[PDB]
Amino acid sequence: TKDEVNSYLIPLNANRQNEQVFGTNLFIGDGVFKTTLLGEIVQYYTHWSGSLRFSLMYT
Amino acid sequence: TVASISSGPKHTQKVPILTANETGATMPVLPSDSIETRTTYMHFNGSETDVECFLGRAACVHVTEIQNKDATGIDNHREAKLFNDWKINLSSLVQLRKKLELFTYVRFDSEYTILATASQPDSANYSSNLVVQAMYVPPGAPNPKEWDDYTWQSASNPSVFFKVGDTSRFSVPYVGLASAYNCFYDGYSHDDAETQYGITVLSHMGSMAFRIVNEHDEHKTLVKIRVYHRAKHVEAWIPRAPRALPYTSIGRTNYPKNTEPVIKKRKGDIKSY
Amino acid sequence: TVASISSGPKHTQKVPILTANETGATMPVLPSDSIETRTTYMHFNGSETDVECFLGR
Amino acid sequence: GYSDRVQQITLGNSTITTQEAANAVVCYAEWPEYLPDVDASDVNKTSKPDTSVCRFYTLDSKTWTTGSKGWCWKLPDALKDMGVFGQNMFFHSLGRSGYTVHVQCNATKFHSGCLLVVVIPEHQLASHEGGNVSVKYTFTHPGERGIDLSSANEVGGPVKDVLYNMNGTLLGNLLIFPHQFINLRTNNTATIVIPYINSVPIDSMTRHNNVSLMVIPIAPLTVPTGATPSLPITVTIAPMCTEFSGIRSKSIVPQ
Amino acid sequence: GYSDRVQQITLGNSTITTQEAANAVVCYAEWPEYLPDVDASDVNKTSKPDTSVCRFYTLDSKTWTTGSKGWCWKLPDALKDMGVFGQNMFFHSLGRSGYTVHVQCNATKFHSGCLLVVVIPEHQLASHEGGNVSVKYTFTHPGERGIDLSSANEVGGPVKDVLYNMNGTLLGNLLIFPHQFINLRTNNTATIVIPYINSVPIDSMTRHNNVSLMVIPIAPLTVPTGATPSLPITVTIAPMCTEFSGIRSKSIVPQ
Amino acid sequence: INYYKDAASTSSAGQSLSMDPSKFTEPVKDLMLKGAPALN
Amino acid sequence: INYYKDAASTSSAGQSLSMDPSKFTEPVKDLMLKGAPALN
Amino acid sequence: PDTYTSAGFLSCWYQTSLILPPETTGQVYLLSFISACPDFKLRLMKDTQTISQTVALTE
Ligand SMILES: Cc1cc(CCCCCCCOc2ccc(C3=N[C@@H](C)CO3)cc2)on1
């Protein structure tokens, strides 16, 4: 509800099976993407095309 | 080039004038296949029927209007025409529209000319030269709320400033997302049960915003903007049947109900001249 | 210029998609490292993202 | 002894023979071909089921009677349910295809009647409401049933007025589109080969139809005396050079 | 720095990475390949959907607990419903395929337990009734669910006794079949590549399963103190070099 | 002489002088010769 | 053609067409090869 | 955000499940990054919705 270091953290629960960790659409100019450097630059242009690289680092 | 060759009497087993139209072809029959002709030359190239020529002259595509007046106490600039805006499009006026829709896909650069003339309806004094600002507000970029918003800074968005009475001219490359612009589109933006049908969904090219830069004088001044569009570097694919009924909407093919017969009825018989 | 090369099935000991981000690098991974791709060309130069262009209006 | 008249088309595991053809049209003089790399954008390798999708599907038959106004099918819609063509269609994000269309109608040397068989690239329909009423999805996705131009206006559906091609243009000028006539006295089939025509290299098969096939009686059917007053018309269509790309979960579409 | 240990398998539009592998087995030292002409009999050209069928399908997960007896899946059955692989399956008369099987089970350095992962060509099951009672169809076509060897005898189903491999042979000798162990202390996955093994060049995919994949706990799962007493096991399988032939109407199979 | 850098800014294009109606007037699969019978 | 004497008076510069993200994307001291293990 | 032009979804699920060692407890987190492949194209510059102002700033 207010910007926090915690919205960068995707939590994981021990022992859950089959279940879903997170979900998002890919509107790179809006939503989660919007404040990232990528999101932030994309917004200076009208059209984009290309591949995106999404990585997850485990802690 | 010969337009007709010389040809004389014929009594053959080779009849070029009998064909079968069911095949879908238009066989290239000439005067000399069925009468006796003399040589004549063409003297002509077909220059002025080139599609570049056909779509290449400026056509009026939009007339809007804005006014210069005291905005003091105006709660909605947009609504007071303190700065109008236009949802760029090329089918709002019909002379050019019928011409483009002779083709299915079209690709070209645009050259815009913008003429702005002023009118002073309410008996007046001295008119101080107004300067119009025309911004390109593509989709995704802040759209102006007051006639003097931060938006008008237009630090990344192309804008032209010219004087009322003058003309502004610049040219924009082909901004389509695909390889050509669709003159027609028998699709939807997604498989939704209620989404709009047509090209409206493909036409997105954003809008263009006009305003006067001048603050207000004692009288009010009406400025009427006319946008002209000229296609340059034209490429057109797949010819279609010309438009017969009147148009009702930007981007749909719809015609009006209880329209009138478009084929002229004979005054007389089939046999009449 | 190719935007993507053609690439087919892989069953290797050489895994380009596992990295250690703690190092500070952004490893240059491409679609063709993890799916089967077909050739495609760029058709584009990146002209309008030059800083001269970005700050030049 | 080859005539323009007799023909055989074998495609996949299915063959068609006509003994009374009138040549065949190849739209814009181009034959279907796969998508070249130089024209490609999506980086995905595509899937080319070949013979399992490139065979002939015969849609259900229509009945030409003296009152018929004409019928209209959209592609790839008409085939949305045919065998593996259809599955592939709902399961990939993008697909592309050309077709061979074979329209059949035989009678006798005493009948008269003439149908126009035409293919219209990007046939955007008009709402009969006028103004800027849209034509809902379901209405432009009739499936194998196609649209029956002599059916009644419905709400959210297109206009079905024949002298206007369902779009504000005159029936008479449809001849600028690849087409062929079936004149009972000459002809008994019509065959058109359709190359893939779009402004993008590959597209969605469900949100956009890229051709409407239209069969329209123009010279009314006239049967011999005390003959039954009607003839069936059958449409058989075969996808050719089909490619699918971007496989996943399987689209869910309205209705 | 290549280890036997880390691996990547990319097949179609799907990729698997393991950081704790124990090499991989290729049945009988042969890698899946298409059907050569010299071996062909049916004259039909076959369909090779390629990347739309040769990708990785992850079946639903199992739960290894201290009481588990083992699970059994049959191929191509287990995949009868996965994406376009499955459609092709029901729609052609004949089909043929090899697979990459990747079984996954991770724990920690305090757990113990060891699973046997084995592929048995032509695993004909036994009826628990004895005599010459048959094993009904449905029972040998469990689909993605597979057979749970610790479930109860059912009527018309197979016997589920583990020391006998469901056929009158001893668990101990299953090691003559291509197999790999998952020993929590070593291993976290098992990967086996299966070439197509049959006495005919191509066969029906619905009346005959050509391998059973079997995962059997052998050294019981032992979790660290006050750990939850169970681990999930996941099976992901990818058809490879698949070919379908004799397309038609679409099989209807019991139940 | 172009005074401007971008191609969109140049004047109108110059006549195709391409002209080939056969894709529209004769898209038949087997070639028809004028003078020979239409249907054999 | 420059009409003016000073360099500041010339038009915009022309595309770097330089482009080398490695100072930003891979400033590591010991070179990392894609495909080889990150940490050995 | 355009519909016609939309790019998909990204989701993440447990394949087997997270397992913590003894003497350990609670949630673990993943950090996630985004960057563009060398593939990428951006065109037709415009103004960002990410910054605006109501009066000129001063010193
Ligand atoms: C200042 C200033 C103002 C501008 C405007 C830039 C031009 C953007 C417009 C791009 C061209 O717009 C269209 C819209 C529709 C169509 C079209 N619709 C179909 C019927 C056919 O073509 C073609 C071009 O640029 N600088």
Which residues in E lie closer than 8 A to residue C38 (C-beta atoms)? Answer: none
Q: Does domain B1-273 have CATH number 3.40.50.970?
A: no
For tokens 């350990």, what's the residue? H24
3-state secondary structure chain G: CCCCCCHHHCCCCCCCCCCCCHHHHCCCCCCCCECECCCC
CA of B63 from ligand 1 middle (Å) equals 15
Surface of B (110-169) touching F: CB under 8 A: none
Alpha carbon B109 to chain centroid, angstroms? 13
Cα distance between residue E139 and residue E155, in whole Å = 9
Q: Is ligand 1 within 6 A of the CB of residue B202?
A: no
Residue B214, amino acid:
N
Q: Does B176 touch chain H (CB under 8 A)?
A: no
Alpha carbon B150 to chain centroid, angstroms? 32
Select the residue of C15, C24, C56 nearest G28 (Cβ to Cβ). C24
CB H37 to CB C31 under 8 A? yes
Cα distance between residue C16 and residue B118, in whole Å = 66
CB E8 to CB C9 under 8 A? no
Experimentally, how was this structure solved? X-ray
Our answer on whether B and G touch (3+ beta-carbon pairs < 8 Å) is: no
The sign of the dihedral angle between the CA atoms of E192, E193, E198, E202 is positive
Cα distance between residue E167 and residue E159, in whole Å = 8
C-alpha neighbours within 13 Å on the C-beta side of residue H52: 13
Deposited resolution, Å: 3.0
Cα distance between residue B256 and residue B251, in whole Å = 14
CB E52 within 8 A of CB E84: yes
CB C21 to CB A45 under 8 A? no
Q: What is the dihedral of CA E51, E53, E55, E60, to 10 degrees?
A: 160
Q: Which residue of C has its CA nearest to B159?
A: C57
Cα distance between residue A42 and residue D72, in whole Å = 44
Q: Does C41 touch chain D (CB under 8 A)?
A: yes
- Interchain CB contacts (distance < 8 Å): B and D: 154
Q: Is ligand 1 within 6 A of the CB of residue B96?
A: no
Which stretches does DSSP call E strand in E33-70? 57-58, 62-65
Question: Which string of DSSP letters, residue by residue, matches B5-69?
Answer: --------S--TT---GGGS------GGGTS----EE-----GGGSHHHHH-S-EEEEEEEEEE-
First to last CA, chain E: 52
Surface of C (1-57) touching G: CB under 8 A: 14-16, 18-20, 23-29, 33, 45-47, 50-53, 56
Question: Which residue, by CA, sits nearest to atom 18 of ligand 1?
Answer: B90
Crossing angle between the packed helical segments E83-91 and D83-91, to the nearest 10 degrees? 180
For chain D, where are the alpha helices, taking DSSP H only?
Answer: 83-91
CA of D140 from ligand 1 middle (Å) equals 29
Cα distance between residue D44 and residue D93, in whole Å = 11
Question: Which string of DSSP letters, residue by residue, matches D122-161?
Answer: T----BTT-TT----GGGG--GGG-EETTSPP-TTSBP--
Two tokens, residue D43:
């980086």
The sign of the dihedral angle between the CA atoms of H24, H26, H31, H32 is positive
> Which of C5, C30, C38, C39 to mutate to probe the D interface, most D CBs <10 Å?
C38
Surface of F (10-29) touching B: CB under 8 A: 10-17, 19, 24-28
Our answer on whether D and B touch (3+ beta-carbon pairs < 8 Å) is: yes
Question: Which residue, by CA, sits nearest to atom 19 of ligand 1?
Answer: B183
Quote the number of domains for chain D: 1
Cα distance between residue B44 and residue B140, in whole Å = 50
For tokens 């197979």, what's the residue? E158
Surface of F (1-40) touching D: CB under 8 A: 22-24, 26-30, 32, 38-40
Exposure string of H17-26, with b = 16+ CB inside 10 Å and e = fewer, is bebbeeeeee
What are the distances in angstroms from CA E158 to CA C22, E169, E211? Answer: 53, 14, 16
The sign of the dihedral angle between the CA atoms of G27, G28, G32, G38 is negative
Exposure string of B1-36, with b = 16+ CB inside 10 Å and e = fewer, is eeeeeebeeeeeeeebeebbebbbbebeeeebbeee
Exposure string of A20-41, with b = 16+ CB inside 10 Å and e = fewer, is ebeeeebbbbeebbbeeebbeb
CB B156 to CB H45 under 8 A? yes
CA of B112 from ligand 1 middle (Å) equals 9
Q: Is ligand 1 within 6 A of the CB of residue B181?
A: yes
Quote the number of domains for chain G: 1
Cα distance between residue D23 and residue D3, in whole Å = 9
| Domain region containing F24 | 1-40
Q: Does H56 touch chain A (CB under 8 A)?
A: no
Cα distance between residue D208 and residue D24, in whole Å = 27
Strand D189-194 relative to strand D25-26: parallel, antiparallel, unpaired?
Answer: parallel
CA–CA min distance B137, chain C (Å): 15
C-alpha neighbours within 13 Å on the C-beta side of residue B56: 17
Chains that touch G (3 or more CB pairs under 8 A): C, E
Cα distance between residue C38 and residue D44, in whole Å = 6
Q: Does B46 touch chain A (CB under 8 A)?
A: no
Q: What is the CATH number of the domain that holds G5?
A: 4.10.80.10
Q: Does A27 touch chain B (CB under 8 A)?
A: no
First to last CA, chain B: 36
Cα distance between residue D211 and residue D75, in whole Å = 6
| Domain region containing D75 | 1-255
Q: Is ligand 1 within 6 A of the CB of residue B225?
A: no
C-alpha R_g of chain C:
16
Q: Which residue of H has its CA nearest to C47?
A: H43
Two tokens, residue D190:
């019509």
Q: What is the CATH number of the domain that holds E243?
A: 2.60.120.20
CB E59 within 8 A of CB E86: no
Cα distance between residue G6 and residue B154, in whole Å = 29
Q: How many CB atoms lie within 10 A of CB F7?
A: 12
Select the residue of A44, A45, A53 nearest C29 (Cβ to Cβ). A53
Domain ranges of chain B: 1-273
